């Protein structure tokens, strides 16, 4: 009475935001230091889990 549940997992990697969801939900948030590019504006390749 012990055993294994095997579950495969799916992670989309390096995809891209569709045309509707490109907002920020508030004005000032996720803001860089003022001489910095704000790298969240380009297509992401990283992934975190």
């Amino acid at each position: 009475l012990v055993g294994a549940m095997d579950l495969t997992f799916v992670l989309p990697l390096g995809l891209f935001n569709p045309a509707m969801e490109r907002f920020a939900a508030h004005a000032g948030d996720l803001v860089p230091a003022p001489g910095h590019p704000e790298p969240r504006a380009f297509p992401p390749r990283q992934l975190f889990f």
Binding site: E21, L30, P44
Partner: protein, 49 residues
């Protein structure tokens, strides 16, 4: 092998998104300028490990 299905987990494109999606999705930053987030939908959601 029965549903021919799989499940996501908690994953995102930024550590900034991984931080605010912690304690659950009561305030999950699901999307941002190009970025995105997937909250875990699973038989394993709600559990610790």
């Amino acid at each position: 092998g029965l549903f021919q299905e799989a499940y996501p987990i908690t994953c995102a494109s930024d550590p900034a998104l991984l931080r605010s999606a912690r304690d659950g999705e009561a305030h999950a930053r699901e999307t941002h300028f190009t970025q995105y987030l997937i909250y875990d939908a699973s038989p394993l959601k709600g559990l610790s490990l």
